[PDB]
Amino acid sequence: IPPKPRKILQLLRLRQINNGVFVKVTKATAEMIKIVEPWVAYGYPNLKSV
Amino acid sequence: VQKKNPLRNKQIMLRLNPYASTFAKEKLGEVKAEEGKPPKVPASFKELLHEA
Amino acid sequence: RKAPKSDNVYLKLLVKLYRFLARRTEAPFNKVVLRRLFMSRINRPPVSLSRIARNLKNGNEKKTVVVVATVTDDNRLLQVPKMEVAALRFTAKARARIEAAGGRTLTLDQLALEKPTGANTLLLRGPKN
Amino acid sequence: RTYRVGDIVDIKVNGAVQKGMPHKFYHGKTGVVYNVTKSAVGVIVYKRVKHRYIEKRINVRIEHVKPSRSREDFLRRVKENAELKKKAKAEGVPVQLKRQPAMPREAHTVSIADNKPVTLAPVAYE
RNA sequence: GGUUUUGCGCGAGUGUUUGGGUGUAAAACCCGCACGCGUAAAGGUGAGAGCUUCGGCGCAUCAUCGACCGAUCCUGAUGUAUUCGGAUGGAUUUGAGUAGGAGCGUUAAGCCUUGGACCCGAAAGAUGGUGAACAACCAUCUAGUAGCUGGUUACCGCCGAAGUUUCCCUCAGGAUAGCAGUGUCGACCUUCAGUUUUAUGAGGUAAAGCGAAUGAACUUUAAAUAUGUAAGAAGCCCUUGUUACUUAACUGAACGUGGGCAUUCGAAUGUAUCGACACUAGUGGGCCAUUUUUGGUAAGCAGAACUGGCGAUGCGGGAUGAACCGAACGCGGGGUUAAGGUGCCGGAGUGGACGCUCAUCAGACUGGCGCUCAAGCGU
């Protein structure tokens, strides 16, 4: 993993595989997760998932 | 000493959420919709759907 | 830390006493004394009678001087004021000059009994290098 | 242009005069002035290597160096923040001071009246 | 013999053991004069641990403004033996200087220099002898020395690299910084960040339009893609004096001003923290791949920066390896997967839908057997 996406993944508390976090959808955070798209899978949770 | 799943153990759910008993009793998960005759889809929407 | 580097058993006794104090009181004085008890000899430089005589100047003459080191005699100081000093060790000339001036000499356990939290104390450190 | 010692200065480097030209790694950079001469100016600029940063002191003369327009946002922000906080304290109401990161859009409706959608195909044949 | 650190005794002093006395006799006990080393020959302001009678007092240390001295630069006093001296006011002065001592001795560990010097390993050279018959041998100096080999002895745990920047000069190299670690000090999620966002730098680079002007160099708008800078308290703004500076001139700079903002104190997210000082081992290969860029050849190829890995990496796949894909490691039980697979070897489908292909050595996201409405190919 290149150092900049690895820094993003350490900033999002995703330092291990199959790790989940809740992120408020913000254009700064949106650009961060669009940067680390080759490593993550993300989407909109419903009430049951939370 | 031992984490118990509230979705499997009902007593743990009642400990964390006291509303679970009356949520299950009053059937707020099987709530029905508002009654009355529903209107029909407008023709404009249907002609927009099956366009060229 | 976990243990003092000193092999002096009485130093370890003082370390146990001030571990208890630091744990069971909200006094930063006891924590600082415990930290300085853990420290090495080069990090605890000798404090001379003249340096204490300087620091006992404005409104501290009625306070109890606390030195976690050895107080040494200073020949440059001609007149020794009245002083209540609590320290690890005293040299013979320093102790004799303190008691000859009407002052008093204390160890750290007498300080821990008379002043368990360090009220109205004057913590003094020796010069570095 | 006159330059002080300690101002944030950005360099762009043209090809008009080849005297005292810096390398393309310094092309279009930004630094801080510590030295001013009759012609040249000494600028500290940060430099990346592997895992760390090294400051480098470089000399560029007048026609490629200019005062940067990166800092004026700080002064305008402190001026407006002070002034609307003064108005908020005078009027006794809370007001918003920070910068918001532009939350996503809310819900709304668009009318089909006078805006009938057109149907398209991958190629525009006409 | 130096040097760093831990413990210990005494401490402006410290060290009995050259020696003397003594003894239950190489022990232990005592010390008269020396000698070695060291010491001698307190100011303001702001932070700051700690204390507080809540008013404040403020360690160590740092910053800044001052004070004194060896000596240096002029001005050159009363005086002077009449050719000596330095009083007052000035300097961008220094110092291994002062500004309320820290050392001495010992123990343990590490490092450096010299002695055989971690162990073994030349050709030689010298001294003194033994023999012959046209230099050789013996003993010693000598455990000689130079490079360069080979070897260098229980276990477990924790932490763990580099194969680079710069300088100087022998060629036969060191120093500095970097990566790893230790102690001290200062704060402490204050603050910091291989990061996004906002403004900003070089690319208006692509595009769209020119029923707008003008002509990729056209532009209202504006990509993609990467990379510097700033995001308040170490802060803001303006007003007024001084300065050794600067300019025609507060034209700017620095030193003195004032105000209010601690209940969005002035984006996001993370924060199991960072900075400085001091001290200590191992290392200075190259290779592959990517992105961008330049040039040449019949074609390969050559020159730059970039990160990721290898050296120092085990496991699942990959027909062996290697590269490449997955994923990085305490000992076990259960469940689920990644890459890759489900005709047999081999665990799991001769699974399903649609077509194509018969190849006199097809083809296999084939290794072998073998396969043909596949066990091949595409979804």
mmCIF file of N, CA and C in Angstrom, chain D residues 18-69:
data_model
loop_
_atom_site.group_PDB
_atom_site.id
_atom_site.type_symbol
_atom_site.label_atom_id
_atom_site.label_comp_id
_atom_site.label_asym_id
_atom_site.label_seq_id
_atom_site.Cartn_x
_atom_site.Cartn_y
_atom_site.Cartn_z
ATOM 1 N N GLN D 18 18.856 34.137 -17.531
ATOM 2 C CA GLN D 18 19.390 32.861 -17.077
ATOM 3 C C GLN D 18 20.393 33.005 -15.939
ATOM 4 N N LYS D 19 20.546 34.202 -15.379
ATOM 5 C CA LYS D 19 21.507 34.424 -14.306
ATOM 6 C C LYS D 19 20.873 34.075 -12.965
ATOM 7 N N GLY D 20 21.534 33.206 -12.208
ATOM 8 C CA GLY D 20 21.044 32.790 -10.905
ATOM 9 C C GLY D 20 19.748 32.011 -10.943
ATOM 10 N N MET D 21 19.562 31.171 -11.956
ATOM 11 C CA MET D 21 18.319 30.429 -12.064
ATOM 12 C C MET D 21 18.349 29.182 -11.178
ATOM 13 N N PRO D 22 17.239 28.872 -10.517
ATOM 14 C CA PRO D 22 17.152 27.649 -9.718
ATOM 15 C C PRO D 22 16.604 26.481 -10.533
ATOM 16 N N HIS D 23 16.723 25.291 -9.949
ATOM 17 C CA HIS D 23 16.371 24.058 -10.634
ATOM 18 C C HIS D 23 14.844 23.936 -10.737
ATOM 19 N N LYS D 24 14.396 23.004 -11.583
ATOM 20 C CA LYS D 24 12.970 22.771 -11.798
ATOM 21 C C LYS D 24 12.276 22.168 -10.582
ATOM 22 N N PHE D 25 13.029 21.591 -9.641
ATOM 23 C CA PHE D 25 12.427 21.189 -8.373
ATOM 24 C C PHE D 25 11.979 22.397 -7.561
ATOM 25 N N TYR D 26 12.643 23.536 -7.740
ATOM 26 C CA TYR D 26 12.244 24.784 -7.107
ATOM 27 C C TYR D 26 11.332 25.626 -7.991
ATOM 28 N N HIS D 27 10.963 25.129 -9.169
ATOM 29 C CA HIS D 27 10.118 25.885 -10.085
ATOM 30 C C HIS D 27 8.709 26.003 -9.509
ATOM 31 N N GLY D 28 8.230 27.238 -9.385
ATOM 32 C CA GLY D 28 6.908 27.498 -8.837
ATOM 33 C C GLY D 28 6.733 27.114 -7.383
ATOM 34 N N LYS D 29 7.677 27.489 -6.524
ATOM 35 C CA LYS D 29 7.665 27.091 -5.122
ATOM 36 C C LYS D 29 7.365 28.292 -4.231
ATOM 37 N N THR D 30 7.410 28.063 -2.919
ATOM 38 C CA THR D 30 7.126 29.097 -1.932
ATOM 39 C C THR D 30 8.086 28.941 -0.762
ATOM 40 N N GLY D 31 8.604 30.060 -0.257
ATOM 41 C CA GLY D 31 9.528 30.029 0.859
ATOM 42 C C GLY D 31 9.515 31.290 1.701
ATOM 43 N N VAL D 32 10.494 31.418 2.595
ATOM 44 C CA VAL D 32 10.576 32.544 3.521
ATOM 45 C C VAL D 32 11.941 33.213 3.381
ATOM 46 N N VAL D 33 11.941 34.538 3.254
ATOM 47 C CA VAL D 33 13.167 35.284 2.988
ATOM 48 C C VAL D 33 13.945 35.486 4.283
ATOM 49 N N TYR D 34 15.244 35.164 4.252
ATOM 50 C CA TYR D 34 16.152 35.493 5.342
ATOM 51 C C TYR D 34 17.303 36.397 4.929
ATOM 52 N N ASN D 35 17.487 36.651 3.636
ATOM 53 C CA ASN D 35 18.648 37.383 3.156
ATOM 54 C C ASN D 35 18.208 38.193 1.943
ATOM 55 N N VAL D 36 18.584 39.474 1.929
ATOM 56 C CA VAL D 36 18.303 40.387 0.826
ATOM 57 C C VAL D 36 19.612 41.051 0.414
ATOM 58 N N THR D 37 19.913 41.025 -0.884
ATOM 59 C CA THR D 37 21.102 41.658 -1.445
ATOM 60 C C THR D 37 20.685 42.792 -2.381
ATOM 61 N N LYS D 38 21.674 43.337 -3.096
ATOM 62 C CA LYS D 38 21.398 44.334 -4.126
ATOM 63 C C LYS D 38 20.531 43.752 -5.235
ATOM 64 N N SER D 39 20.822 42.527 -5.657
ATOM 65 C CA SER D 39 20.040 41.845 -6.678
ATOM 66 C C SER D 39 19.361 40.581 -6.176
ATOM 67 N N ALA D 40 20.113 39.649 -5.601
ATOM 68 C CA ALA D 40 19.579 38.351 -5.219
ATOM 69 C C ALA D 40 18.898 38.420 -3.854
ATOM 70 N N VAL D 41 18.151 37.363 -3.540
ATOM 71 C CA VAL D 41 17.432 37.226 -2.282
ATOM 72 C C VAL D 41 17.582 35.783 -1.819
ATOM 73 N N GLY D 42 17.941 35.610 -0.543
ATOM 74 C CA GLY D 42 18.034 34.308 0.088
ATOM 75 C C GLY D 42 16.724 33.850 0.698
ATOM 76 N N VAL D 43 16.251 32.690 0.249
ATOM 77 C CA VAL D 43 14.967 32.129 0.645
ATOM 78 C C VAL D 43 15.205 30.734 1.210
ATOM 79 N N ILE D 44 14.576 30.444 2.343
ATOM 80 C CA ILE D 44 14.486 29.088 2.865
ATOM 81 C C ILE D 44 13.260 28.426 2.255
ATOM 82 N N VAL D 45 13.446 27.219 1.727
ATOM 83 C CA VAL D 45 12.357 26.419 1.180
ATOM 84 C C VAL D 45 12.501 24.991 1.698
ATOM 85 N N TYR D 46 11.380 24.395 2.094
ATOM 86 C CA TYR D 46 11.390 23.039 2.620
ATOM 87 C C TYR D 46 11.537 22.030 1.483
ATOM 88 N N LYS D 47 12.129 20.879 1.801
ATOM 89 C CA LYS D 47 12.389 19.865 0.791
ATOM 90 C C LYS D 47 12.118 18.483 1.370
ATOM 91 N N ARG D 48 11.418 17.666 0.586
ATOM 92 C CA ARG D 48 11.095 16.289 0.935
ATOM 93 C C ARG D 48 12.276 15.386 0.609
ATOM 94 N N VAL D 49 12.604 14.472 1.520
ATOM 95 C CA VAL D 49 13.473 13.342 1.203
ATOM 96 C C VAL D 49 13.048 12.154 2.061
ATOM 97 N N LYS D 50 12.592 11.085 1.396
ATOM 98 C CA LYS D 50 12.160 9.835 2.018
ATOM 99 C C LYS D 50 11.071 10.064 3.059
ATOM 100 N N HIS D 51 11.469 10.178 4.325
ATOM 101 C CA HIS D 51 10.534 10.309 5.430
ATOM 102 C C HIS D 51 10.597 11.665 6.121
ATOM 103 N N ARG D 52 11.463 12.578 5.683
ATOM 104 C CA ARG D 52 11.725 13.773 6.472
ATOM 105 C C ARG D 52 11.885 15.010 5.592
ATOM 106 N N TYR D 53 12.012 16.146 6.281
ATOM 107 C CA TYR D 53 12.063 17.482 5.705
ATOM 108 C C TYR D 53 13.411 18.129 5.993
ATOM 109 N N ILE D 54 14.041 18.673 4.954
ATOM 110 C CA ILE D 54 15.268 19.452 5.092
ATOM 111 C C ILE D 54 15.028 20.841 4.514
ATOM 112 N N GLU D 55 15.364 21.871 5.286
ATOM 113 C CA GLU D 55 15.308 23.249 4.809
ATOM 114 C C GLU D 55 16.523 23.510 3.922
ATOM 115 N N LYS D 56 16.308 24.198 2.806
ATOM 116 C CA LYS D 56 17.383 24.566 1.900
ATOM 117 C C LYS D 56 17.362 26.071 1.648
ATOM 118 N N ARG D 57 18.555 26.665 1.631
ATOM 119 C CA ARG D 57 18.724 28.102 1.454
ATOM 120 C C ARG D 57 19.200 28.364 0.033
ATOM 121 N N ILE D 58 18.384 29.084 -0.733
ATOM 122 C CA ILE D 58 18.573 29.288 -2.164
ATOM 123 C C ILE D 58 18.537 30.779 -2.484
ATOM 124 N N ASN D 59 19.142 31.155 -3.614
ATOM 125 C CA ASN D 59 19.293 32.559 -4.005
ATOM 126 C C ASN D 59 18.610 32.800 -5.349
ATOM 127 N N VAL D 60 17.538 33.602 -5.345
ATOM 128 C CA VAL D 60 16.875 34.061 -6.569
ATOM 129 C C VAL D 60 16.763 35.580 -6.539
ATOM 130 N N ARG D 61 17.026 36.220 -7.675
ATOM 131 C CA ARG D 61 16.883 37.665 -7.789
ATOM 132 C C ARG D 61 15.462 38.036 -8.232
ATOM 133 N N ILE D 62 15.265 39.333 -8.501
ATOM 134 C CA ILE D 62 13.980 39.998 -8.260
ATOM 135 C C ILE D 62 12.889 39.522 -9.219
ATOM 136 N N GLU D 63 13.224 39.314 -10.494
ATOM 137 C CA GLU D 63 12.172 39.189 -11.503
ATOM 138 C C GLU D 63 11.388 37.882 -11.424
ATOM 139 N N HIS D 64 11.849 36.885 -10.662
ATOM 140 C CA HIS D 64 11.083 35.656 -10.494
ATOM 141 C C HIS D 64 10.424 35.511 -9.130
ATOM 142 N N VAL D 65 10.795 36.327 -8.149
ATOM 143 C CA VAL D 65 10.246 36.238 -6.800
ATOM 144 C C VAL D 65 9.138 37.273 -6.657
ATOM 145 N N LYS D 66 8.078 36.923 -5.929
ATOM 146 C CA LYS D 66 7.033 37.901 -5.650
ATOM 147 C C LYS D 66 6.397 37.585 -4.305
ATOM 148 N N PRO D 67 5.782 38.572 -3.645
ATOM 149 C CA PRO D 67 5.048 38.271 -2.409
ATOM 150 C C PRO D 67 3.852 37.374 -2.685
ATOM 151 N N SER D 68 3.679 36.370 -1.832
ATOM 152 C CA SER D 68 2.646 35.370 -2.044
ATOM 153 C C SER D 68 1.287 35.879 -1.578
ATOM 154 N N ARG D 69 0.238 35.322 -2.176
ATOM 155 C CA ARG D 69 -1.143 35.611 -1.809
ATOM 156 C C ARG D 69 -1.789 34.406 -1.124
#
